[PDB]
Design a protein around this ligand. Structure first.
Ligand SMILES: C[C@H]1O[C@H](O[C@H]2[C@H](O)[C@@H](O)[C@@H](O[C@H]3[C@H](O)[C@@H](O)[C@@H](O)O[C@@H]3CO)O[C@@H]2CO)[C@H](O)[C@@H](O)[C@@H]1N[C@H]1C=C(CO)[C@@H](O)[C@H](O)[C@H]1O
Length: 388
């Protein structure tokens, strides 16, 4: 017997949310005495909304779609139910290891993996063909390509998202850098790779290879890509269905995807994704654990991919012929296997804010790449007291 209310806060976007609400309410098929109360909470509001509710014990959800960085964030302040030895964990070993690391805090499991992701370079196949160019493998080749795309088609080569710090990471990795050396507790973002990365992004916009905006970046990016204003953008699996809604990409066929470009030293893209957690103060714990088990089951992960092309965390699901043949999946899974894994620390998501501010000021010309990198590092040393 399961019964009662299970309130689920989902952060999925406008293209994803009808699918996730249907999946959530499908828990009631097998458990008709449970009432699933689906709520969609915008991504940028959800961390604060959950903390406010959990800290007040007031209108907190039973189950929270928890970003990979949010697990240690929320768990560090006691807001998540530990899951070890509960029915929430079924076939745990099925999950990709890097997925499983984000679920852990101080030797306890506080979430179950849902989707895994990384950033990639999406491109308009027809524009590149019309421009006579190949999909660029590096920043250097992207600049050459962008000039041909402007000269032959009038589009801009790249929409470079300028208001979300996560988009700095491919450039950092491509210049040979990283945020921190975790094993050695050393801040590394202000090494010369960080200077070079800020410089590359500024050059892409100044040279007119790319355009950007200081606000409303998600909408501006998607609108520029879908309208053919740009030929390329960096984005993740959560954009696929949104892009395919557009006249230009109905023909799933016109939507190309490739790795983010290499920089002067190498290439990399960050690992991201979503897990599912239970609020520590839930008044319907059995029903919530079962709900988490259901939402993370192989069946529901397979359905998510079939409807949205989001990537499963469960290895078995890749073997299901239907997942094994989705062309967005066949590209993204190897890219995810290569993606760079961050420190899963309480302060992890706070590492993004200094990048946000310094990247904005580099793009507007208020701050040099040199000063931006040093400022980022200074902010990290303040955030991480036992880092040098
Ligand atoms: C800045 C943000 O970057 C990283 O998060 C990325 C997620 O891992 C991706 O999955 C993707 O999230 C989208 C979901 O897939 C989608 O279903 C829907 O929820 O919309 C999401 C946004 O489009 O993209 C994210 C990057 O945009 C990183 O891992 C994450 O921790 C970072 N978030 C921090 C930054 C801010 C504000 O700058 C806060 O709002 C967050 O609470 C922080 O955690």
């Amino acid at each position: 017997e399961l019964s009662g209310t299970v309130t689920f806060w989902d952060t999925s976007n406008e293209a994803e949310k009808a699918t996730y609400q249907a999946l959530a309410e499908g828990f009631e098929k097998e458990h008709p005495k449970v009432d699933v109360k689906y709520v969609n909470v915008p991504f940028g509001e959800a961390n604060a909304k959950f903390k406010n509710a959990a800290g007040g014990n007031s209108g907190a959800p039973d189950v929270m779609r928890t970003e990979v960085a949010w697990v240690a964030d929320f768990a560090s302040i006691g807001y998540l139910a530990p899951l070890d030895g509960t029915p929430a964990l079924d076939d745990g070993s099925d999950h990709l290891p890097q997925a499983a690391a984000s679920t852990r805090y101080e030797g306890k499991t506080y979430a179950v993996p849902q989707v895994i992701d990384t950033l990639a370079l999406f491109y308009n196949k027809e524009l590149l063909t019309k421009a006579g160019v190949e999909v660029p493998g590096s920043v250097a080749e992207l600049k050459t390509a962008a000039a041909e795309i402007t000269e032959k088609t009038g589009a801009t080569g790249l929409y470079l998202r300028g208001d979300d710090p996560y988009w700095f990471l491919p450039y950092l990795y491509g210049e040979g850098g990283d945020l921190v050396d975790e094993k050695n507790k050393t801040v590394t973002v202000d090494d010369e790779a960080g200077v070079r990365a800020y410089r590359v992004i500024k050059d892409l916009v100044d040279s007119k290879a790319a355009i950007t905006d200081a606000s409303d970046g998600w909408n501006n990016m998607q609108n520029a890509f879908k309208s053919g204003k740009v030929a390329m953008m960096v984005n993740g699996p959560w954009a696929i269905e949104d892009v395919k809604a557009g006249a230009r990409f109905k023909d799933a066929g016109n939507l190309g995807v490739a790795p983010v470009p290499a920089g002067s030293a190498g290439q990399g893209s960050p690992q991201g994704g979503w897990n599912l957690s239970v609020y520590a103060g839930s008044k319907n714990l059995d029903a919530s654990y079962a709900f988490v088990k259901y939402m993370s089951s192989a069946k529901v992960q397979q359905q998510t991919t079939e409807k949205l092309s989001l990537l499963p965390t469960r290895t078995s699901v890749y073997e299901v012929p239907s997942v094994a043949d989705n062309e967005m999946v066949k590209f993204f899974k190897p890219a995810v296997d290569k993606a760079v894994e961050r420190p899963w620390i309480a302060e992890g998501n706070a590492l993004f804010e200094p990048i946000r501010l310094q990247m904005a000021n580099v793009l507007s010309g208020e701050t040099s790449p040199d000063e931006a990198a040093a400022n980022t590092g200074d902010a990290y040393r303040k955030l991480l007291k036992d880092y040098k």
